[PDB]
Every structure is written in structure tokens, then in C-alpha cells.
């Protein structure tokens with residue numbers, strides 16, 4: 838069976854805040870297509886070749 | 888003649904493609920074929936009755 842992840846458990850309260858004391862720069866990536874190949878077709882030489 | 892009009896506008900147009908004319912007619916066949924020895928029939932010295 839697929840595991841959705843390590844069951845975590847967050848400890849909510851009503852008088853408790855959790856403030857980070859350190860940070861981290863993190864160069865991610867993202868990849869995107871922009872254009873595809875530019876084809877063309879001539880009817881007479883495809884259907885009726887010679 | 889490809890736009891079927893009389894005016895054309897500033898641009899590039901993909902007309903027909905060019906291919907030089909195929910004119911002649913070639914019929915090549917293996918010359919390995921040999922003549923059947925019918926000479927033995929027609930040039931036979933004596934025919935049957």
C-alpha cells in the first residue's frame with residue numbers, strides 16, 4: 838500500500854509559539870517547456886508522392 | 888496561385904515544393920533469361936509421322 842508519509846503530530850497549544858532561530862538559502866529549480874518543434878507538410882508529396 | 892488571390896502581403900509564403908520532372912520510362916529485366924532450345928524442334932532432321 839502507498840505510504841503517504843511519516844505520520845507527524847503537531848503539538849498545538851493556546852499559549853505556545855515556535856519561532857525559528859536560524860535560516861537557510863535554498864536554490865531550487867523549475868523546468869518549463871516554451872516552444873515545440875515547428876513542422877510543415879506539403880499535401881501533394883505526402884499523399885500523392887511522385 | 889497558391890493563395891488564390893491577386894494581391895499578396897509583406898511576408899513569406901510556403902508555395903508548392905519544386906521537384907524536376909520525371910520524364911523517361913525505364914524497364915530493365917535480368918538478361919540472364921536464355922532462349923528456349925526450340926531449334927531442336929524446328930531444325931530437327933526428321934519429323935515424326
Ligand SMILES: *[C@@H]1O[C@H](CO)[C@@H](O)[C@H](O)[C@H]1NC(C)=O
Nearest residue numbers: 847848849850851852853854
Ligand atoms: C488553554 O485552553 C485550556 C482548555 O480550554 C484552558 O483551560 C486554558 O485556560 C487556556 N489558556 C488560557 C491562557 O486561557
Ligand SMILES: *[C@@H]1O[C@H](CO)[C@@H](O)[C@H](O)[C@H]1NC(C)=O
Nearest residue numbers: 856857858859860861862863
Ligand atoms: C545557523 O546555521 C548555520 C548552518 O546551518 C550554522 O553554521 C550557524 O552557526 C547557525 N547559527 C546559529 C546562531 O545557530
